[PDB]
Amino acid sequence: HEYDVGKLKVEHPWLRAPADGEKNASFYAFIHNNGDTPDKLVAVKVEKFGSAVIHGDAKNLALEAPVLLPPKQKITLAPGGAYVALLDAKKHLEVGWGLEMTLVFEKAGEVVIDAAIDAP
């Protein structure tokens, strides 16, 4: 599944459900900038988590930094690379359901998505 906003496409947003005992999750997606002007993923809003921290600099995965989206390029958020940390889960996440999230882009603005929840 995929979502479009402006000239951006967010393809198969997904995450691995927290392991039993853990309250944190890692959010992943394949983001395309199909436009001629740059953009940035600057925030993520999720009701089921206390906060969301964008780790968009693949060279330094401990830094809180937006995901830069240069024109005409595909940026992948994936395990072992850039990702969004979802911190302080409020209820248990059901594998097979979606996690409803709002992505906030600097120029293209907000888009409401459903992330596919995988087993731990």
User: Considering only 7-15, 27-35, 56-64, 101-109, which stretch makes contact with Cu ion by CB under 5 A?
Assistant: 7-15
Among 118, 120, 104, 115, residue whose Cα is nearest residue 13? 115
CA distance 67 to 56: 4
Report 22-51 residues binding Cu ion (CB under 5 A): none
Q: Does 96 interact with Cu ion (rule: CB under 5 A)? A: no
12 binds Cu ion (CB under 5 A): yes
Comparing CB distances to Cu ion, the nearer of 12 and 23 is 12
Identify the burial level of 76 via C-beta atoms within 10 angstroms of its C-beta, where 0-12 means exposed, 13-18 middle and 19 or more buried. middle
Contact footprint for Cu ion (CB under 5 A): 1, 12
